[PDB]
Structure 1
Amino acid sequence: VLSPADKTNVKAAWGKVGAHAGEYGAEALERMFLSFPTTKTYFPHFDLSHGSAQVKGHGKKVADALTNAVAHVDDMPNALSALSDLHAHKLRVDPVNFKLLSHCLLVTLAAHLPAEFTPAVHASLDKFLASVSTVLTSKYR
């Protein structure tokens, strides 16, 4: 249940993220690979070293997806439909990993939003990322 209240807190917070979305996306991935090494099993074709252009590029795509989800927060299932299919039938990333990336995105946001990352916004963002994760795994089986 991403409440309307959560939706607007997310729109405002992500709005503040603004032009740094891609950077934060890449940073979140880097944090995930270091904090949770098991997530690296999904990127054997990537150089996962600090500064990797592949991690940076993928980060912009993850950010594109999140930005698009925020812009269509009232119908995320539709907005994330292509990605739900991709992760469910091709990538087949175990559902547990979405919580790991979500946590790293929160940490990244906390590290960049001193004033905005209040307890309430922290809760809304967590629920938002959980909602995104649920949508992305909705077609797994």
Structure 2
Amino acid sequence: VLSPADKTNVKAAWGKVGAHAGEYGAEALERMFLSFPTTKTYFPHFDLSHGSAQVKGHGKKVADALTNAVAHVDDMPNALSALSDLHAHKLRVDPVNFKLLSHCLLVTLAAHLPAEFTPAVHASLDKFLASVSTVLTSKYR
């Protein structure tokens, strides 16, 4: 459960990403593919090498998804319902993987926004990403 402070924190931090939104998401993704190679198998249709137009494309998609959660932090199950269905029903993504990506996201954030990534805020972001992962995995059937 997120607190008002977590909320204020995550909002605040995310805000400093600006036009870099899709660029970071693409990085986190790359980070993930490299550190955790098992996750590569969910994208046989993408070229995952550095600079891949696809990864760049998907990164932005991921970047927006999260902005949506940030904007709809108090109604996350609902805002993300559409994607929850995608990941579990159609994609069948192992729930284990939402933890690897949530990590590669924090990594990328600290590597680009050091003045924002304080311990209090790192706490907030972790709780956030976990809430998200909780929702995109809340629909297995």
Aligned to 2:58: 58
Residue 2 of structure 1 and its aligned partner are, at CA, apart by 1.7
| C-alpha distance after superposition, 1:6-40 (max 9, x if no partner) | 11100000011121111000000000000000000
- State how far apart, in whole Å, the 2-side matches of 1:36 and 1:103 are: 11
| C-alpha distance after superposition, 1:85-116 (max 9, x if no partner) | 11111011000000000000000000011100
| C-alpha distance after superposition, 1:45-82 (max 9, x if no partner) | 11111111111100000001000110111101111010
1:137 aligns to what SS in structure 2?
coil
Aligned to 2:89: 89
Aligned to 1:134: 134
- State how far apart, in whole Å, the 2-side matches of 1:138 and 1:7 are: 21
Higher helix share: 1
Q: Percent identity?
A: 100
Listed as ranges, the gaps of 5+ residues in structure 1 are: none
- State how far apart, in whole Å, the 2-side matches of 1:85 and 1:8 are: 28
TM-score (norm 1): 0.98
- State how far apart, in whole Å, the 2-side matches of 1:3 and 1:111 are: 25
Superposed structure 1 runs of 4+ greater than 6 Å apart: none
- State how far apart, in whole Å, the 2-side matches of 1:34 and 1:26 are: 13
Count of aligned residue pairs for this structure pair: 141
2:39 aligns to what SS in structure 1?
helix
Aligned to 1:122: 122
TM-score (norm 2): 0.98
